Each structure stands twice: as C-alpha cells, then as structure tokens.
Amino acid sequence: MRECISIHVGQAGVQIGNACWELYCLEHGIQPDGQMPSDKTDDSFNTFFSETGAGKHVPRAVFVDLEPTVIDEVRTGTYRQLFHPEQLITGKEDAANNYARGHYTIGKEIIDLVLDRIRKLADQCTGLQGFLVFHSFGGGTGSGFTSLLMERLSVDYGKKSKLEFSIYPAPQVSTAVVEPYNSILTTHTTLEHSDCAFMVDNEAIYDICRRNLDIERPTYTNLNRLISQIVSSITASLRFDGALNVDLTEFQTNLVPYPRIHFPLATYAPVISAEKAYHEQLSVAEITNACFEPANQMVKCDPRHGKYMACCLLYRGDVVPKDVNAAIATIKTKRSIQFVDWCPTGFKVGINYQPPTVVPGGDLAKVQRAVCMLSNTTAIAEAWARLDHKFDLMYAKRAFVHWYVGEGMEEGEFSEAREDMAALEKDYEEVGVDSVE
C-alpha cells in the first residue's frame, strides 16, 4: 500500500479535481456517497481512497481556494458526501489574479491550515509515494499559492515526489492580462520543488473539443472532462495493478533525464464525439499513429522541430503486445522520430487492461481501446518561448508591475524569474546538441 495525496489549488485545480474524482469513482465503482459495492470479489484503488469504519471510501485529496465560490459548489454538489468538510479549505478574498497576493499577502493566512490537513492525510498513509498538485499558471491562487505550498512541502517532506498538472494559459479562455507574469513567477519559484510536471495547454484542449468533439464554444466542463481522461490514463497504473508507472518514482526515472527538463508532452487518442453515427472501432495501429500527430497533443508545439529524450506509451483496454510491436514497426519506416545521441531510439510500453471510462451523458464516446503517449521532447521549449515573449513585451514598459510591488514583491524578482526562464530555454537547446568526448 503506497498512497498518493492529491492537492487542488484555485478554481482551475478544484474544477479539474471534480472531473478527475468523478471519473476515478466511475472507474472503481464508488458511488457519490463513497459506498463501493465490494460485495463480490484489486485493492490498488486504496492508493487514492482511504476507507472509513462505515465502509465508505474517501479521496486522499485536499481542495484549497482563497475564495469560497467554487469549493462551496463541491460542498452542495453531487459529491458533497464523498469529501469530509476538513479536506475542503477556503479563504474569504482571492489573490485578484496576482501571484504576489497569492504567495505573500493572502496565502500566508491559510498556509499553516493547509499543511495541517496535508499532515493529517500524510499520517493515514503506511507508505506515502508523494503528491499530485493541480493548478492554473494564470490565476493568483494557482500561481502564487501553489509556489508557496510547494516550498513548504519540500521542507516538511524532504525528498518526497511532487508532481504537477499545470494549466498553461490560452487567450480564448484567459481572464487576466497578467497571466504571463504569474506563469513565469510561479515556474521560477516551483522549478526546483517539482520532480515532474504535465502541462495542459488550454488552447490545445479547446481546439480538440472544437475539432473532434464538434463543440462550437467549449466550456470548462468540456475542457475538464477531456483533461480528466488524460489524467486518468496517467494515474491508472497507481490506482490499478499495472506494470508501467506503477509508482511515482517510476514517472521521474522513466521520463526525467535532468532535474530542470521535467516537462513531458502528453498526447491522447482517440477523442470521438458521443453524438455521432456508429463506427467500426479504431485499431492499435490507428490509435498509435495518432500519437505522432500534433493535432492530438496536450501542449501546442512541433516535435519535428525537436528531439525525444524519453518516450512512454500507455495503452488501455483491448490491447495486445503483438499489435503494439506491429504499430511501432510501421512508424519507424515512414517517420524519423529523432532522439538524442545519449538515449536509445525506442519506447517503454505498458498496457492497462481496465477499459477507458466515460462520464454518461458526456461529450466523449466509449471506446474498446485508447492510448496516452508521454514524451520528453525539446519541442516543449516552444511553449516557454511564447510565454517568455509576452512577459518581455509587458515588462519592458513595467506594465502592471505596480500591482505586484504593492503587495511587497521586489522588481528584482521579475528579473530573477525571467533569467531562470532564459536559462531553462538555453537548457532545452544545450540538451538537443551532439555529445563529447
């Protein structure tokens, strides 16, 4: 029994949390009251759910927001019975889309309170693997509070795995002009504290909904139900008796070659609208080829313009090894898939028999097989580059900086944060070159 503690910070984190936990429940047969009909019986589900004396199953999770609106919905909603009041934490006033206000001013008021419940939950654990942190790069809570939390977690839980699910900002759904500031300031503060982090580009999700799910104007409900699918695909092997990424340590070992380059790219397939004419289910070959198509990526970038340093294929459902090896063979003939000098050109492949699950009445159609490729490519540097430029445009004129300095931040911190981004960008370049000897 190797437990995982999930932390959801700010509106984005809490709402994706709601999608994730709703999906986990469906995947494990747990009803919204926590009651699981175990009546006729793999136990691995316990890495994510504590059991009570009543026989009910409680998520090893904490929901934090500097504001009560979103969590107040959780406590009146369908799953209000699943979570204990103590694990749903709220302040009265948000960080006003300002990293400073989240990290320095408002954050300090609730930090000890949050670590206290994390401590509690960190006890009911007979072999803690680490933490799964869900947050937006853009908002003041998701940026400012998360970076503050990550820092104290490193102190209290010295060298214990900390993994992120970070929402990369898209202008289509963006609510604040200052998101590039908060993005860079949080990335800088968090960098040394996170072991591995899966970025979810809101424009990528938005476009997949529009294209594959035929959604004219995608909503956070549509985005999150999609995100959840990938998150479930990633966490499956921890929550079921898997063989690949069976522990968090494995993620890091399997995908992170260097401490700073810890941002793997996620690609999921197939994404099909539920409200469409019946179709002859997709083959292992069809779904595999889809992993090398940028239209299915979780972050908008071009892996042609990059080199792989680690690749992982997570097959779900009706998948046979012979069909997977056949699919990989075909790809190599037709496509380059450049790796770095140091790594072998290949893939770590895991099959999880548990079929893919869908929220009934959802946008996604139920499939007999699916796949999520996790790949550490130098091409992800393109996502930092876009954000870094937007930062540069505003910082040159010090636009909005007074909001940050006003909350006790120093102008030098922006320089420090950006210099570290400049170094991260250079590290992706340096890593893609020839080795010597």
């Binding site: 793999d42 691995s44 400073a100 320095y104 001013t105 300090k108 820092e151 104290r152 490193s154 102190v155 010295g158 040394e192 092997s237 079921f240 008796d241 898997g242 063989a243 690949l244 069976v246 401490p259 090894p321 997977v324 090896n325 990989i328 063979a329 190599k332 898939i337 790796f339 000098d341 140091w342 790594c343 072998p344 050109t345 290949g346 893939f347 770590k348 492949v349 895991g350 099959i351 999880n352 028999y353 548990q354 006003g406 909350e407 006790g408 931040m409 120093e410 020839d434 080795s435 000897e437």
Partner: protein, 135 residues
C-alpha cells in the same frame, strides 16, 4: 528492418515492456539544497515589511493632507478676523477725526461771535468819553 523487445513486468491489470528500434548513437556519458524554513520566513517577512511600509507611507501623506486642511480652515478664520480688526480701527479713527473737526468748527464760530461781544462793549467805552463828558 530490425527491432529489440525487452519484457519488463507482468501483473493483474496489465503488462509492460521496452521496445528498442535503434540503440543510442553516442555511448560515452554527457542537487543544490534545499531551501530552509528560516530562509522562507526571512523572504516572507521581508515582503510583509515592504508592504506595511508603503501602506504607512501612504497613510503619512493622507495625514499631511489633513494638516493642510486645518491650515486653510485656519487661514479663512485669520482673514475674517483681520477684516473685523481693519473695519473696527478704521471706523473709529474716522469717528474721532470727525468729532475733532466738527467740535473745532464750532469753537471758531463761537470765538468769532465772542469777538463781537468784546467789540460791542468796547464801542460802549468810546461813547462813555462823549456821553456825559458832554454839555
């Protein structure tokens, strides 16, 4: 034209293995603590001190504005007061200068009529040397 499969793990909910298309091209090789809680507190409390400082500085300026507000209200009091003081001394000096002039105007006008009486009796003396020192 050639591939290598390395079986990794077999379990209840699935199996894992590694596929090698080509080995690495290159074969010959390509931490900083911590942070302290005391260091976190130091940085957190430095910001709190810069924030409390700029709020205080702001409050000091609103305090300067009030001190000025009392001053203009004070100026208006001193102006209405000096106005009263000019008006009082002016009107008094004018009332004194007039009483003065006016009294003197009569002083001479009676003094001229007093000369008349002095001369009338004086004329009666000139007649005395004639009237009965006569006939």
């Amino acid at each position: 034209a050639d591939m290598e499969v390395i079986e990794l793990n077999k379990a209840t909910s699935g199996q894992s293995w590694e596929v090698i298309l080509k080995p690495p091209s290159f074969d010959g090789v390509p931490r900083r603590r911590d942070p302290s809680l005391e260091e976190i507190q130091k940085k957190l409390e430095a910001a709190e001190e810069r924030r409390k400082y700029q709020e205080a500085e702001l409050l000091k300026h609103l305090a300067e504005k009030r001190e000025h507000e009392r001053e203009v209200i004070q100026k208006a009091i001193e102006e209405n007061n000096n106005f009263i003081k000019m008006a009082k001394e002016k009107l008094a000096q004018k009332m004194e200068s007039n009483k003065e002039n006016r009294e003197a105007h009569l002083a001479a006008m009676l003094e001229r009529l007093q000369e008349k009486d002095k001369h009338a009796e004086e004329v009666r003396k000139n007649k005395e040397l004639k009237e009965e020192a006569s006939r």
